[model samples]
Target: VNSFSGYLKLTDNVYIKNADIVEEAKKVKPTVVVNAANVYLKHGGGVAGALNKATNNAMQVESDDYIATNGPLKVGGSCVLSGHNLAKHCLHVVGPNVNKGEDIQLLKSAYENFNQHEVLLAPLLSAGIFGADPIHSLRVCVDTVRTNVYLAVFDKNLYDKLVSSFL
Candidate 1:
């Protein structure tokens, strides 16, 4: 499935609750985790805020820094995953098929973007840049000017049950 180009990378003091991405990445130099997202909305759009306005089924990605957009944003923490930052889209996805390998690949790619400075916005993120864990993601979402964090959970019906939900 190389058809999919890239996805969101974690930022904002992202150390695992028990472990750590840096530690895990060190153990495995090239690693990423792409978890299916379950974004709860505190705004007008909710999870649907993360989706590409043009394509409703899949996630959105744009090359230029000046792309057309009418998507809603919700601030979570200090990190800016939504807006026109590193990633083209905030990347709201659900869990992988049945295996977890896809998730890892996704995670790795997102972090790689951060490492490469794909996210161009100057984040209010101070220490959050340490690396993405739960705290940073939460902070980014909670503090987002748009309240838009690309979250994922293993709920089978998240895409449907959640209003304005997308990945």
Candidate 2:
């Protein structure tokens, strides 16, 4: 379903999905993991915050440089950082605030950029703190790339419920 003009692309597999993103990162030990971050890089909040707290603020240190040098990161655009704690690489994208619908497409775009990477873990973009509909978010990611993706969810209850509904 290529319906969003140039905004969506789906691989043979649904590259976007849900799991405990962080836990899966540790288990799979993928080279890269994508987090729903903010333009501010004030990772003390949202999903990024969980990752921030886990890794001893390593993500923020790299993300901070991106913001300070390039100004606030734009939506759909992502910055890759040296990974610590679990994965070898961290990809942070500025997610939308509140319920901006386009953030779905933008989130998908972020995955599209990393389609070349062999194995990557990503969260369902804009779903939790950003107030996005998880199912819609899944479609955006699943429909966006050809790479092998491990989708992550923070709450197990939420994760199982979401999977039953989406998968």
Candidate 3:
């Protein structure tokens, strides 16, 4: 397992840390925890699935109901839902699949939507199944996030890469 755990200060209010998102969400108790979700908001795997499991599938149920009413979230769009178990609120943001083109702008839009929160926790957007490079996604996240942020990174290799770039 990746035992690396620490943080790097990005700005006065923003920071990135090497930690599991679900575990960190419980520890930090931020105003909201963000899920790097798909346009359909299905909590099938990756950060979405982990968060859903952590909340005992309550998050999935809420997400299903939200999508049922609102339709699929467009790429770069976001919606907030009531959190369960560990978090008080959840912000679901959809980022672009790099193969689709315009990944950076859509990724930035995903991060840009976080400006409303005072304190929030999030993982790298579009860096998993959506296929954006992790470092590229991290750069967008660092540039756009305005509020106090705890960026929870779970991969040791990616964490080391971030340290090399930022520290």
Candidate 4:
């Protein structure tokens, strides 16, 4: 198994990490964490699923209840909900259905609008269950915000490769 751990900064505000989200969440104690949610906020799989379990399904239940009224939430649109995990809050964005380049702009829009905290954690938007490249998604996120960004990666091998290049 890969033994690498900890985080590395690529920019003044962007930090890449090789750690479990749930594990890190407890340590970092972020004010907000980003969740790439569907319009319906189902929290079905991937990071969404992890967040759901970690928070004891509080986020999932709230998101499901909220999305019923705001069905078909647009790309870049989100619901700012109270967090039950490490983050004090959650920004659940409607991630793109496919990586059509628009996903970058969509994620950027959501981040740009929702960002107003000291520490914000995010994954590579659309990179997991959404099947977009993590590098591409991470780049888009950092470039768009041009500010502090924390990433928690679950993929050990991928994290190692990424860390090697940067480290």
Could you arrange the candidates by TM-score from highest to lowest?
3, 4, 2, 1
Better of 1 and 2 by TM-score: 2
For TM-score, the strongest prediction is 3
Q: Estimate, for each residue in 113-136, the C-alpha lDDT of model 2 and write its tens digit.
A: 567676667787787878877777
Clashing pairs in 3: none
Which candidate number would show the highest lDDT if scored against the true structure? 3
TM-score preference between candidates 1 and 4, better one: 4
C-alpha lDDT of residue 140 in model 4: 66
Candidate 4 lDDT, 1-167, residue by residue in tens: 12224668777777788777777777766777778787778887888888888888888788777767666677777778887866788877766656454555565666564456556777777777786677766666676776467888889898877667552
lDDT of 1 by residue, 29-130 (tens): 221222123222111222232223323323334312212342332221112234222133333222121132233223332333333332222121211212
So what's the TM-score on candidate 2?
Answer: 0.78
What lDDT is obtained when candidate 2 is compared to the true structure? 0.68
Where does candidate 1 have its weakest 10-residue lDDT segment? 121-130
Per-residue lDDT of 146 in model 3:
76
- Can you give the TM-score per candidate against the true fold? 0.20, 0.78, 0.90, 0.83
| Reference-based lDDT, each prediction | 0.27, 0.68, 0.82, 0.72
The parts of candidate 1 lying over 4 Å away from their true place are 1-48, 51-101, 118-167
The stretch of ten residues in a row with the least summed lDDT in candidate 4 is 1-10
Error of 3 at 7 (Å): 2.4
- Report model 1's TM-score to 2 decimal places: 0.20
What order do candidates take by lDDT, descending? Answer: 3, 4, 2, 1
